[PDB]
Amino acid sequence: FRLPYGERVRLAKNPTGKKLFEIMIQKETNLCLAADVATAAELLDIADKVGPEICMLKTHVDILPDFTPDFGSKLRSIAEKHNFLIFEDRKFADIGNTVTMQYEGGIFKILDWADIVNAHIVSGPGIVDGLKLKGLPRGRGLLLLAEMSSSGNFAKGDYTAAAVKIAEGHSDFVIGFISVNPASWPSGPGNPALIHATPGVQLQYNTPFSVISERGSDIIIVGRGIIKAANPAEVAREYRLQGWDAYLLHC
Amino acid sequence: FRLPYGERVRLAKNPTGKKLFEIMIQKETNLCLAADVATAAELLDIADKVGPEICMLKTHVDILPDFTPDFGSKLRSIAEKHNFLIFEDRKFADIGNTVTMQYEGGIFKILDWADIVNAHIVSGPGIVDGLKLKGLPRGRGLLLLAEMSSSGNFAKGDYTAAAVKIAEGHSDFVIGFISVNPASWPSGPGNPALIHATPGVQLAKGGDALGQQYNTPFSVISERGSDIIIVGRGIIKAANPAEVAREYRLQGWDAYLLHC
Numbered sequence: 272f273r274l275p276y277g278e279r280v281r282l283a284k285n286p287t288g289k290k291l292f293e294i295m296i297q298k299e300t301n302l303c304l305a306a307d308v309a310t311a312a313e314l315l316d317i318a319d320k321v322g323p324e325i326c327m328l329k330t331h332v333d334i335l336p337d338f339t340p341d342f343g344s345k346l347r348s349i350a351e352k353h354n355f356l357i358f359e360d361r362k363f364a365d366i367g368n369t370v371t372m373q374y375e376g377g378i379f380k381i382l383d384w385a386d387i388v389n390a391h392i393v394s395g396p397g398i399v400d401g402l403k404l405k406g407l408p409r410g411r412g413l414l415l416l417a418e419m420s421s422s423g424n425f426a427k428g429d430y431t432a433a434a435v436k437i438a439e440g441h442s443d444f445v446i447g448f449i450s451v452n453p454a455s456w457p458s459g460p461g462n463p464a465l466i467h468a469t470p471g472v473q474l475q476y477n478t479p480f481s482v483i484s485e486r487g488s489d490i491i492i493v494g495r496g497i498i499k500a501a502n503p504a505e506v507a508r509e510y511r512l513q514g515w516d517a518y519l520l521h522c
Numbered sequence: 523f524r525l526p527y528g529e530r531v532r533l534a535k536n537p538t539g540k541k542l543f544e545i546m547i548q549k550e551t552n553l554c555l556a557a558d559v560a561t562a563a564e565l566l567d568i569a570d571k572v573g574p575e576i577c578m579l580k581t582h583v584d585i586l587p588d589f590t591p592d593f594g595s596k597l598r599s600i601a602e603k604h605n606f607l608i609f610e611d612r613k614f615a616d617i618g619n620t621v622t623m624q625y626e627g628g629i630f631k632i633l634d635w636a637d638i639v640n641a642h643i644v645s646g647p648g649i650v651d652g653l654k655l656k657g658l659p660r661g662r663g664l665l666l667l668a669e670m671s672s673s674g675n676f677a678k679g680d681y682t683a684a685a686v687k688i689a690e691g692h693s694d695f696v697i698g699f700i701s702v703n704p705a706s707w708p709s710g711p712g713n714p715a716l717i718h719a720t721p722g723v724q725l726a727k728g729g730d731a732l733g734q735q736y737n738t739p740f741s742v743i744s745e746r747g748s749d750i751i752i753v754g755r756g757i758i759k760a761a762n763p764a765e766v767a768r769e770y771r772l773q774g775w776d777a778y779l780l781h782c
Binding site: 307331333334335336338360362364365366367368369371372373376377378379380391392393394395396397398400401416419420421422423424425426430433 | 558582583584585586587589611613615616617618620623624627628629630642643644645646647648667670671672673674675676677681684721730731732733734
């Protein structure tokens, strides 16, 4: 039994988490673009082209050699135009006091333009306390890295289970998880008020159908197959339909 | 018994690791300043004031709102003037392909100006390969986060032991660890070719409001077997940072001298 996204909108405890479900339902999409292109100019261009097909655009702001102070406002304009959220894949991983400054300040001022960020739990739950200090008043959401797609990683077992307990102690701010196979967690994907987003999706790589329908995730994160396409809008539509149909099979 | 730093120079398998031991003995310091001030202008000023006292200046370049592309050169000039290494505490924690870009590229171009960076092992051992690809040809070194000073952290037990084994497989690049209590590990601090640098250091035990836990210089170096004390707020929130830094230097060096 899977609750439909429309029943989970009312369960989400954070305003960004609620918005994410609302976008998915309105646009019939559970697709996140991993916008791993060479420059900010290419990022804004591909965000505009694939915007109709996505619920979320995932960025690495610290890879862009042409970052400028207006990058965030230009990307926010595109997100508002096409109705998607911006997720900065910053993987915060420091002590609580440091991450406050890495999130709110510096050159990137991530808090001002990213709806969602993610964090590892390795430094302990103080990382959540530090990101929440400036994130929660702004209405932002946090995803915890409970599992990862890379070889030999340590986000497994008791570590994954600890991420679930941290999320449930901080659900004013933690909207969900980065996860790989939450169906195979001891308790499964767990509380439907929290959302799962899964990297490594491709038509190691797993198919949209496997990720959504077999593995119990909620959002597919897709990069290379769209980024490298001759026609990214056309390929993004294919991924949206695959991920959405996989969800509908249960819902 | 522990080896004097000068006797470990010959064991270092990476040139930045070797240089770090050489600086510590030249200057009689095992102090690293965590220069977590509000601006790059203030960072460069404090690095110049405290530089005589330190073997390494640790930065968080992503907290500086006035960062510009001349930062690396300006900080390297101070590092040369006062003979210290630059450690960017970026805590890389992504997959290999992404970390390569976050190290060599973007706006910060960390590889251009940081002698040392650090990485978490949580994403798997491939993170080391990702950073080594462009760091090793430039002679850079890497510290692995085997433990942390923050409350409730997960860098413990089998995770710490895995970081030790990953380091063993990458002696060309991994110069040592961020660690907290290496004397407590099954075989102690381990291979003396590797260095241990410990955050969470203040003259009095205590903590902050967001999970930081502080131990004294003497306990870190002498009791817990580390090699380097990393001190941030203990120095940078002082009215006279240079004088406070000299107090920490003397405590950490004397703690090490007790074992020589």
